């Protein structure tokens, strides 16, 4: 038999994607040698399999390049040689993905996996396909887009403590639509810690922190007044700040408008992108536990706000009930759990 040469590309091909290696395989024989150079004549690092039947590139291939593949094979019935030249995808634009939570972080039972692209994603399906989530113990999850750039992944219910999550965003070489290609791959890993659920009950005006079902702290709170009430629902703990200036204009409300404000506060834990914080409020200690006086944030005592900062972590849960407000939007950025699972699972890749 004369040996036969097969490749993962064809001669004269254009738009060869670089999300996978280029490979050459031999049948009815073995590969004697395979070489690959780019348009500037430099070799491409590759490796021949021990059995001599498969050759594959071992380094990242580049965008908008011309490669020349040269392969020679040997069999009982003579030798076979081929040359192939192909062109890789030429993006119109590159987009870089940013993953949360951080690599090695320990986060609460509510933490969603977040892939924030820095461009609009025309082909949401292609993005979802390039993201591999792995969980141990394995638990079901699904993708849902909060806007044109950020997509989230979470299970039907809060994470189980101790679960290990692994995220591979393999977008390099992936055509994300309208000439948009991934700039790089990202790989992160995080672990779920203790179940921390804090319930802010407007009927008692108390914020109770439960760790694995055990009450560990009770905090009088003053939430948003009737005109600017705190919305009910599930809040995900975001960032923690030793101190921060709360600026209403960050959310589109001028500081000097009737509902505006600019307040430097201590021990601030963000629980919504709309501007809700758990923070120190020494001015409302008397009101805490009795009357709502804020623009929506959970006012608590300095010591309690500091305790919250020191003992609550990213991804923990704050649940607000019995307020005169509505329900936190599901696409706030930290309100993922207010979206019904059936709607989340269905997704919105379009």
């Amino acid at each position: 038999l004369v040996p036969k040469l097969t490749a993962s590309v064809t001669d004269g091909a254009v738009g060869v994607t670089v999300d996978a290696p280029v490979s050459v395989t031999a049948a009815d024989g073995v590969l004697a040698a395979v070489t690959m150079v780019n348009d500037n004549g430099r070799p491409v690092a590759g490796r021949l399999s021990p059995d001599g039947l498969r050759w594959s590139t071992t380094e990242q291939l580049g965008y908008n390049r011309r490669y020349t593949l040269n392969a020679t094979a040997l069999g009982l019935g003579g030798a076979a040689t081929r040359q192939l030249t192909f062109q890789t995808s030429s993006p119109a634009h590159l987009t870089m993905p940013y993953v949360m939570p951080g690599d090695g972080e320990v986060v609460g039972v509510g933490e969603p996996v977040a892939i924030r692209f820095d461009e609009n994603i025309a082909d949401r399906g292609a993005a979802e396909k390039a993201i591999k989530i792995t969980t141990n113990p394995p638990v079901e999850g699904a993708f849902y887009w909060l806007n044109n750039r950020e997509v989230r992944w979470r299970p039907e219910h809060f994470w189980k403590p101790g679960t290990a999550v692994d995220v591979a965003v393999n977008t390099y070489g992936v055509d994300l639509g309208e000439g948009m290609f991934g700039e790089d791959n990202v790989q992160t890993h995080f672990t779920i810690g203790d179940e921390v659920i804090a319930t802010a009950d407007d009927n008692t005006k108390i914020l109770t922190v439960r760790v694995n079902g055990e009450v560990v702290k009770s905090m009088p709170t003053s939430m948003g007044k009737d005109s600017t009430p705190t919305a009910n629902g599930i809040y995900i703990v975001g960032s923690r700040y030793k101190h921060i200036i709360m600026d209403s204009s960050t959310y589109g409300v001028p500081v000097n408008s009737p509902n505006g404000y600019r307040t430097d506060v201590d021990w601030a834990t963000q629980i919504s992108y709309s501007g809700v914080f758990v923070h120190s409020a020494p001015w409302s200690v008397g009101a805490q536990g009795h009357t709502n006086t804020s623009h929506g944030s959970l006012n608590v005592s300095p010591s309690n706000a500091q305790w919250f900062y020191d003992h609550v972590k990213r991804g923990d849960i704050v649940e607000v009930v019995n307020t005169v407000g509505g329900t936190l939007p599901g696409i706030d950025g930290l309100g993922d759990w207010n979206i019904p699972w059936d709607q989340w699972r269905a997704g919105n890749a379009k």
Binding site: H93, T95, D118, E119, N120
Partner: peptide, 4 residues
């Protein structure tokens, strides 16, 4: 322009 449309990055950020």
């Amino acid at each position: 322009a449309x990055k950020x």
